[PDB]
Amino acid sequence: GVCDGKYYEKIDGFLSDIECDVLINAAIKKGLIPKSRNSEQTWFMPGEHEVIDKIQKKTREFLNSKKHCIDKYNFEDVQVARYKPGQYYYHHYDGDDCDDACPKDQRLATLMVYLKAPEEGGGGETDFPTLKTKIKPKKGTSIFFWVADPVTRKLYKETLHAGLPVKSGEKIIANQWIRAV
Numbered sequence: 001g002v003c004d005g006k007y008y009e010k011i012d013g014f015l016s017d018i019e020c021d022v023l024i025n026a027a028i029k030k031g032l033i034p035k036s037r038n039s040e041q042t043w044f045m046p047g048e049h050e051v052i053d054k055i056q057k058k059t060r061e062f063l064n065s066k067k068h069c070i071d072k073y074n075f076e077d078v079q080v081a082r083y084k085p086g087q088y089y090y091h092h093y094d095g096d097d098c099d100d101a102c103p104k105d106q107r108l109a110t111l112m113v114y115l116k117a118p119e120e121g122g123g124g125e126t127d128f129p130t131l132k133t134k135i136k137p138k139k140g141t142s143i144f145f146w147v148a149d150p151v152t153r154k155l156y157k158e159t160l161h162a163g164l165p166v167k168s169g170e171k172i173i174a175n176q177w178i179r180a181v
């Protein structure tokens with residue numbers, strides 16, 4: 001079963017408000033501005049930015065409380081993504097659906113930080129439909145969730161998720177994916 005039965009965990013104040021703004025501005029300087037993904041994205045190199053460094057440090061410290069669930073992993077380069085009104089990410093898994101040929105570098109988990117939330121009544125929730133829960137974006141809050149089993153690398157299909165449409169304002173996230181070795 002999933003690590004301690006906790007398919008997702010939410011952490012408020014994972015980044016400070018001014019750390020989120022510094023990261024948004026760095027992403028804008030890099031050019032950030034029916035089914036699947038309808039958003040803009042950019043990628044950060046390892047060590048490119050001190051706020052990325054902090055995401056990865058706190059993610060590692062978090063995973064250190066889960067040593068009985070996960071041994072070796074790698075951090076993917078961090079992605080920052082933006083949603084304008086009308087933009088959304090249709091439901092999907094963050095890893096490869098597999099049984100007997102699971103990739104050796106399968107994504108095992110996701111740590112996603114909300115850098116900027118929609119306006120009041122602005123939609124843009126993160127939906128986990130199988131778990132019957134939707135998380136409302138809040139600046140600085142992180143959502144951690146399990147994507148695949150570290151032993152078999154098969155998906156936890158319980159964490160099917162989506163970014164719902166933004167109705168007003170904008171939504172900016174940072175994705176830290178955790179990969180098998």
Ligand SMILES: O=C(O)CCC(=O)C(=O)O
Nearest residue numbers: 089094125126162163175
């Ligand atoms: O925007 C969201 O709330 C979810 C983002 C997501 O699922 C992803 O980028 O893989």
Ligand SMILES: [Mn+2]
Nearest residue numbers: 003004066068
């Ligand atoms: Mn435990």
Ligand SMILES: [Zn+2]
Nearest residue numbers: 092093094161
């Ligand atoms: Zn996703």
